[PDB]
């Protein structure tokens, strides 16, 4: 599970029906900054977020183990909204 | 014409939280909400048909965990007459 | 902007006993309520996330004392959009 | 602050002989009546503390002779933010 | 302090004919009416004690021949506090 | 399962339900030496680490196998603390 | 006025490992303890408010390896009066 | 004289949450509290009879979900050679 | 002069029983000894008719709000009691 | 450092306790601290392992006399912790 802010959304019309109505968002991994530095992954929401929430999304074979997200196909998922973030007893994010 | 997407709630918070995850799951623009009494309350999205569609899909499953949620549907082409008789927006 | 918080009541009554519950129990700014008719009236308020969270769950058991309680949801951060068409505060 | 006294009927014959009674039995300012619509009518009271809490218990036995009384509700010292964004008389 | 009559009837037809029946029956001023919304309706007249007794009394009977009586009542001396802050015809 | 030095803390609060309760960090791998080189990654704790203590955090599909943590939708976890690492019979880290 | 979080214990090693998890849970201020004789001790929190939820649940379930654990309560914005009258640091 | 309310539990806890419902109920001086060991303590609370009547009240119902509450009382008129002795915010 | 006393587990047992005591009869009220444990006594000190209604006052108002463990009157306490005991009249 | 502690209802059991541990590894006691109601707590610090073969050294030679509360290993209290109880090591 990895930091990340939400950057974007993703909308598919064929797709597998087990997962028709999740909502695809877009994701970067983000330094403990809030500053987006790295790849954009997809991930499904189970949470609500929307763009611009920092969020952690869990990944593989246990990014299932939560309702709407069962035995269907999704190997990367929000399940997180972050409210601040502290390294070292200094806060380097907020919201 | 652009799309048209609608969720008609009994409560309030329904519409709301149907509202925003209609919103945050493609580009759409909420462009209001008509309030016929009773409590029931309707949103009205409207944009491109494939970001509707899972926009509608993901606002019943936003909503239901509320509960009520009356009707959800979704009209691709309306008839200009529509558009110009009655508030979904791009009306003229 | 803020966070959201919203309770919705059958009864203008319960609904000020979760208003007054709320504010008492957190750092949020109370804004007004929305009538939807027919009986249902909806409190709304906003403010950071964990404050509306523990002031929601404390005025949803606050108006359970009194009567029913329909809905009871928080939004940690609405769409950008929402705030521009909804009366929930924070319109431009 | 004023206390806070609140008598809701679902009719408005209801509320009225509960406003009376009110002002009748305690040293109690009456501001007004908010119609949620759906028939369901909220009478508020305001004054002392213990003047509101006789009003009210004494109003509600006038009420249900006549009406079908939906609450009674006392708040002894609302928010500062209640009064200031609530139509409750005590306005600013 | 002119006393005061009231009949909430669910629908338009019982509310007139009821008022009809009032103000026919004795020397009272027919001052409006009050719409909750859901269908209630109310109608108020003023004037002495003894006429409302007699007109009251005297619409429901032609009103129980209509529609659904929710109830009907009297009031020989609104304290002025009521009259100031609800609109039944005597407000200064 | 990785090398690791905690760094931070993360705090949630709007999470998936299923995990309340638990202690989300902020963990950077580290050299055999406590010089942490790499990206903040965040875990669950389950043995009660803090902020500057050398941990192994496990990763994936496995790092359910744990009490207070099973089918809760999580992809790391710490798993022990520490104590020295040797290297071909030199000690390069102690507590 | 940072918020408030307490958690309350029979033993003594309960508070401690509560006590400790609390901060290494969440940017806390831990402020000291209270002990109310009979052996019950309280550990007490204190911080900005979606933190002492963390530790607070955090500890809840940190302690109970341990065993007892008496209450667990958490007031995110105490009043003036309390901070002031209370030994619960915040005060002047 | 100022009136008196008293609050008694096992368990510090109980006593805060007491003691934050309580001056956000009425007008009240939270004045301290008083350990008598073995876990019990005691929040004590001065101001008008009327508000302590409801301020208590909002207690016992805010108390009860936590800890146990021993005891709950309200004093009007306490005699003044009381207030010498014993430490009720009103020693001389 | 005569005793007077009231424990009652429980801190607000003894207040009720203190102005019960204080507002029936003429006597002065020394203070409030803590055992610890949740027991506390309650002392108070005057003429033996007036302890002696007042007390009757005490046990019967702090029954009705708290779990009352004894009540007792002394009407002339040894002198030796006074200088060792912390009962008000100490020398 | 690492913690050590060991809680037991019993004045003697806490010394025996404590004593196990000193003779069985490395460890510095500190003190003790008396919870009320009986209940007294001894607490170790030194390195993580040896505190836990320590304590399971204690809570067994404890187990001879009478009920223990709770055994509990911390291998490094958050540095706040250490400056607001009485646990040694302040600074």
Same mark, same amino acid.
């Given at each position: *599970? ?10 598919? !019309? ?8 999740? !909502? ?7 330094? @403990?900054? +809030?500053? @987006?530095?790295? +790849? ?11 763009? +611009? ?19 269907? @196909?999704?190997?990367?998922?929000? *399940? ?6 502290? *390294? +070292? ?7 | 014409?652009?799309?048209? #997407?609608?969720?008609?709630?009994? /409560? ?8 925003? %995850? ?9 462009? /209001? ?5 009773? #409590?029931?309350? =309707? ?7 494939? %970001?509707?569609?899972?926009? =509608?899909? %993901? ?16 009209? &691709? ?9 009655? &508030?979904?927006?791009?009306? &003229?």
């Amino acid at each position: *599970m990895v930091l990340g802010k939400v950057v974007g959304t993703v909308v598919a !019309s064929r797709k597998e029906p087990r997962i028709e109505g999740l !909502s695809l968002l877009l994701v970067r991994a983000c330094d @403990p900054d +809030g500053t @987006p530095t790295g +790849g954009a992954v997809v991930c499904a929401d189970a949470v609500g977020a929307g763009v +611009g929430e920092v969020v952690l999304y869990a990944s593989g074979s246990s990014a299932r183990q939560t309702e709407v997200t069962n035995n269907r @196909p999704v190997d990367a998922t929000i *399940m997180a909204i972050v409210d601040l973030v502290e *390294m +070292g007893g200094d806060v380097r994010f907020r919201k | 014409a652009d799309a048209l #997407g609608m969720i008609e709630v009994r /409560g309030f918070v329904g519409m709301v939280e149907a509202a925003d %995850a209609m919103v945050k799951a493609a580009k759409v623009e909420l462009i /209001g909400y008509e309030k016929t009494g009773g #409590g029931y309350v =309707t949103a009205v999205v409207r944009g491109d048909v494939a %970001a509707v569609k899972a926009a =509608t899909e %993901a606002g019943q499953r936003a909503a239901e965990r509320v509960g009520e949620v009356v009707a959800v549907h979704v009209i &691709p082409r309306p008839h200009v007459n529509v558009d110009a008789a009655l &508030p979904l927006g791009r009306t &003229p």
